Write a protein that binds this ligand. Structure first.
Ligand SMILES: Cc1ccncc1NC(=O)[C@H](C)CC1CC1
Ligand SMILES: Cc1ccncc1NC(=O)[C@H](C)CC1CC1
Lengths: 304, 304
């Protein structure tokens, strides 16, 4: 029992972190096989960042200008190329610590672990959700660019995020490992609108199931609702509309606890309309949305 | 910017996890040098757990009865001994992945990362505090015993906790790496009183400083207080009394933000007396106490 905001074990990812320097800028790279992946803004100087012409900036760079250091050993760069907003530095040595891996583009509302790094060295690991508006509320300081997000299924690391930018609002934006930004963001030091965010409804319901499994039951009520009635409340409270696909994914949790998904929706409706009344659920005084139904099942069963 | 409940990178600890089996019980062990450390209750059966006679139970065991498996390779046990509530299984091979390490006994209120494991395999990592009452509010299921807590200072892992038990209340109890329980707990399946817990005041103040650094400032007020006046409020709200030693440890944060520690205490006093009024601080709707002043400084400066 107990339910925590658990991140994946970061070991397999730690072994891939490297430091990439170009000119006076240093950030993190991800060394997988004989390729080092990093944010392309490593080639920029302060004057460039307001509106960089990345193609022109990269043309002034040669393989020997990219300084790639793994721990304390230097990697020899034998190729460079830009793919969207990432640079791929081909190196003469395959990373001996390359785990089984995939590059995946996650959907908004999905969760992942971030291994925050500075100068190619890991500082910490935390779990977060990709917001419905494609931002992440992380913990990143200057130098953390190139830190990655990932999920792990037994021995396979699915890399889903690479950190690129902090918006003027203090929220974070980044790309998949092919360098495609999540959301409308561009890698420029310009004010950029992040869409209206919403609370991830299926995740809040999943976390309410986790709460019941672990003993926090005070919010269970004698009511039920419908998808239509619930979505009218979700609309008012800026929650994502619940679909049958979300109900279907909550199936295992509904089966385990014996609480029908629409009955849990009626508990969520009452909590939205009345608040917590100074009470807590799983040590939180708000409705938590950073646990997917898969996360809840995994944590509640002890999947390794 | 941004502030997250960050755990240490778990890589160095993942390389030490092993599976220990004795009879029909399997749990986790920590392999450091040529020694495997694990909870002594691995030698118990269901009939024993109400009041085990560990000395007698261990006498019936020989080196060949302890099955130690690292990933998929079997370790040869050449010695066994019980030290307090841990067993130390001497093996014929030193762990090639043994990091630089220390065994430390942490103080209540201090924080650490837990690498939850099952069958010697890591499932996740989370950060937590040792409660003032010496329990931890973790996430542990049957099979997680032997999972460890730790801190990391550059290349040195300080192991501070080994998981042993879940109290009937769903809170967790364990030992230091010499097998001494934190708190009054005994390794028996018996109802055991955990002391009255309190909120870690110095940590809440540290987190309020983290909030100001990251932009959440709505709780700053035009008031000040004294240690005596603040401790009268701390008493009423079951907060640990603040001492000058706590004020001294908050020094770096008071220096950085320019907010005198007693002025931050007056903000905390107002929050305790009036609540959040439906507002949040660093994404939390309650006063967070799982960040020490050292954790805040580290996260806010990007220490690796
Ligand atoms: C400063 C910082 C703190 C946290 N995370 C990231 C950063 N870096 C940036 O946002 C730079 C300006 C991105 C570049 C325009 C492409
Ligand atoms: C079941 C479980 C779930 C989470 N964490 C730990 C456990 N195990 C125990 O509490 C056993 C009974 C301890 C033994 C008496 C010494």
């Amino acid at each position: 029992s107990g339910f925590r905001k658990m991140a994946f074990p970061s070991g397999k990812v730690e072994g891939c972190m490297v430091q990439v320097t170009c000119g006076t800028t240093t950030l993190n790279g991800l060394w997988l096989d004989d390729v080092v992946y990093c944010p392309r803004h490593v080639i920029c100087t302060s004057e460039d960042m307001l509106n960089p012409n990345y193609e022109d900036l990269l043309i002034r760079k040669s393989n020997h200008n990219f300084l790639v250091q793994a721990g304390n050993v230097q990697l020899r760069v034998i190729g460079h190329s830009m793919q969207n907003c990432v640079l791929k530095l081909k190196v003469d040595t395959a990373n001996p610590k390359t785990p089984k891996y995939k590059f995946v583009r996650i959907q908004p509302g999905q969760t992942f672990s971030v291994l925050a790094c500075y100068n190619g060295s890991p500082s910490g690991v935390y779990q977060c959700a990709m917001r419905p508006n494609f931002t992440i509320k992380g913990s990143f300081l200057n130098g953390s660019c190139g830190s990655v997000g990932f999920n792990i299924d037994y021995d396979c690391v699915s890399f889903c995020y690479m950190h690129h930018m902090e918006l003027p609002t203090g929220v974070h934006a980044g790309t998949d490992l092919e360098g495609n930004f999540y959301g409308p963001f561009v890698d420029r030091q310009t004010a950029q609108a992040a869409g209206t965010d919403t609370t991830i409804t299926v995740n809040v319901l999943a976390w309410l199931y986790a709460a019941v499994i672990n003993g926090d039951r005070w919010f269970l009520n004698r009511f039920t609702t419908t998808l239509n009635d619930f979505n009218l409340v979700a609309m008012k409270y800026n929650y994502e509309p619940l679909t049958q696909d979300h109900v279907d994914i909550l199936g295992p949790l509904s089966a385990q606890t014996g609480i029908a998904v629409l009955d849990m929706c009626a508990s969520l409706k009452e909590l939205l309309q009345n608040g917590m009344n100074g009470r807590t659920i799983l040590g939180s005084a708000l409705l938590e949305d950073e646990f997917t139904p898969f996360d809840v099942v995994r944590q509640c069963s002890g999947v390794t």
